[PDB]
Amino acid sequence: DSLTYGQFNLVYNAFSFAIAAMFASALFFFSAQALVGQRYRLALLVSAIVVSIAGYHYFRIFNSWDAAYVLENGVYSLTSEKFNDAYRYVDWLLTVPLLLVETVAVLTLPAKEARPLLIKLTVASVLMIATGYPGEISDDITTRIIWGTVSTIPFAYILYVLWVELSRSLVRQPAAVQTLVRNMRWLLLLSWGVYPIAYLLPMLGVSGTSAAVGVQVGYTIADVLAKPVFGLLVFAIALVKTKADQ
Amino acid sequence: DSLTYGQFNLVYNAFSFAIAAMFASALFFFSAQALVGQRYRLALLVSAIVVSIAGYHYFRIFNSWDAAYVLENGVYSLTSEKFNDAYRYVDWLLTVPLLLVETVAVLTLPAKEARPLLIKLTVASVLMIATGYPGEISDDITTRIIWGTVSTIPFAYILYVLWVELSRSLVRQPAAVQTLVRNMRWLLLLSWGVYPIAYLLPMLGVSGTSAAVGVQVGYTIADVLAKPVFGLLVFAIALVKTKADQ
Ligand SMILES: *C/C=C(C)/C=C/C=C(C)/C=C/C1=C(C)CCCC1(C)C
Ligand SMILES: *C/C=C(C)/C=C/C=C(C)/C=C/C1=C(C)CCCC1(C)C
Ligand SMILES: CCCCCCCCCCCC
Ligand SMILES: CCCCCCCCCCCC
Ligand SMILES: CCCCCCCCCC
Ligand SMILES: CCCCCCCCCC
């Protein structure tokens, strides 16, 4: 249905803020390669690639939102072009595996262990995103609950596996490294937890237009926390690891 | 006069974006003290203080803008509470001298030279900001040109002195340090140059409401470039200097 002034702007502003955050962080992460040792530059480069891809999609998402509504009679009425919910899920399919690479890369695990860990996590993320999409686009609450519950299964698998692997990497490492890795553990858990909570809004009653606004804003803030903010923690780990290698 | 939908939002969004950028960078700069040597932590702390103060004032600026207009008849009409142009100039009076401290602090000059350099630059910045304010608030174009031209005199003095001092600090320093200091020279010149250009908009013809929107947006983007973005360059210099001290 139609959207109020404040509702259209909240999403409009959220997408504009995301474009700026992704592209500005892309420049930072790319240049920050020169501040860390050679062994950790791949994690910085992948982080720059992640936010560049997300920045491209938020540019497309911004245009899809702008073209979906029209200001008339003091409100925003729905136009003929429907909002493209697929841009975000296509973005997730590409960037979430890259986020997993960035995470494993800064920990410097041996290839015999890093490779099967990455495949299992990447396969799980594809299952998570693929099962979430039909529930995301449904107009039916029961359907949204069923697909979303299925999507929680690989979601819990990824977070459990990453918590254990990050905890196992702590051993022997210097104290400054250990504190950053422990805090990366929590930022991963809390930022990724925003997504299913935001997915739950259309079923907590409330107006359907208010729920749809909350979902779009929630996913956007979550993307900012899980990609550029998370990337800053990866950058700090690379700095301290570079120093420990003297 | 009254403001269109898009005009009120552009400023509304600009102030919201500034609050987020200042407070998020404040947390980063405060914590980044732990990534640099003890001799450079003061520059990081002052940078955190700068953006915390600016964040407070943009919170007050955001509320003053929100309270100055009211949505009615599909437009925004001017309310009884007038917008407070003084918040920004009071903010500049406090943070610009602190920005000058941050700049001198990361260069590690001796006290016999750092102290008189800081006093002369601080006195010039007060003169620059104080003479600019009467021209900023005038409804008369001739008055805006006269006070603004006077304000350009200490403005040019500050930029000339900082260019020379930064250039003189280059000597002997390692190659990685020298490139960052040269780029800090340019970011300072270009970011500070946005302010008088934005000040010029109300005299290039154009609608008065469009000019007022452009001034507020221009100053806000300039503040983001000259405080948190500039602070990231200071942080990089402190990182490379920490390493050169081995
Ligand atoms: C950069 C983008 C990222 C890190 C995407 C994260 C997405 C999730 C963690 C997915 C959450 C979902 C469920 C667990 C609940 C059902 C619906 C989903 C797909 C949103
Ligand atoms: C963080 C805030 C900063 C760095 C403020 C910078 C302000 C200026 C460089 C002042 C510019 C002005 C003139 C040179 C032209 C006349 C009006 C002014 C005050 C805006
Ligand atoms: C850092 C590189 C990102 C470049 C983003 C370009 C986005 C172009 C969108 C074109 C849509 C037609
Ligand atoms: C980082 C500390 C900044 C705290 C900003 C608080 C702003 C409070 C504004 C109160 C206005 C009444
Ligand atoms: C669905 C939430 C999964 C949380 C994983 C955390 C595992 C910690 C166990 C030590
Ligand atoms: C008003 C612009 C002042 C520019 C100062 C740059 C000085 C460079 C001379 C070497």
Author numbering:
A (entry chain A), B (entry chain A): 31 to 276
Describing publication, verbatim:
Light absorption by rhodopsin induces isomerization of a single double bond of the retinal’s polyene chain, which triggers structural changes in the protein moiety to perform vital biological functions. Previous studies have suggested it is likely that GR could support ATP synthesis and compensate the poor energy production when the chlorophyll-dependent photosynthesis is low. Interestingly, GR has carotenoid binding capability similar to that found for xanthorhodopsin (XR). In this study, we present the X-ray crystal structure of GR and discuss the structural features that characterize the XR-like protein subgroup, to which it belongs.
Similar to other microbial rhodopsins, the seven transmembrane helices are bundled in a clockwise fashion when observed from the cytoplasmic side, and the all-trans-retinal chromophore is covalently bound to the opsin protein moiety via a Schiff base linkage with the Lys257 side chain. On the extracellular side, the B-C loop connecting helices B and C has a distinct antiparallel β-sheet structure similar to most microbial rhodopsins. However, unlike BR which has the β-sheet oriented towards the middle of its 7-TM helical bundle, the β-sheet of GR orients oppositely towards helices A and B. As a result, the tip of the B-C loop is facing towards the periphery of the GR molecule and the central ion-releasing cavity at the extracellular surface is exposed. When compared with the XR structure (shown in white), helices A, E, and G are slightly tilted inward towards the center of the helical bundle, resulting in a ~6.6 Å closer positioning of extracellular ends of helices E and G, whereas no obvious displacements are observed on the cytoplasmic side. Since GR in our crystals does not have any additional carotenoids, the movement of the extracellular end of helix E is likely to reflect the carotenoid-free structure of GR. First, there is a conserved Glu-Arg pair (Glu166-Arg174 in GR, Glu141-Arg152 in XR) on the extracellular side of helices D and E that can electrostatically interact to modulate the relative position of these helices. In addition, similar to XR, GR also has the Asp121-His87 pair as the counterion (Asp85 in BR) of the Schiff base, confirming it is a conserved feature in XR-type proton pumps (XR/GR/TR) as well as proteorhodopsins (BPR/green-absorbing proteorhodopsin, GPR/Exiguobacterium sibiricum rhodopsin, ESR).
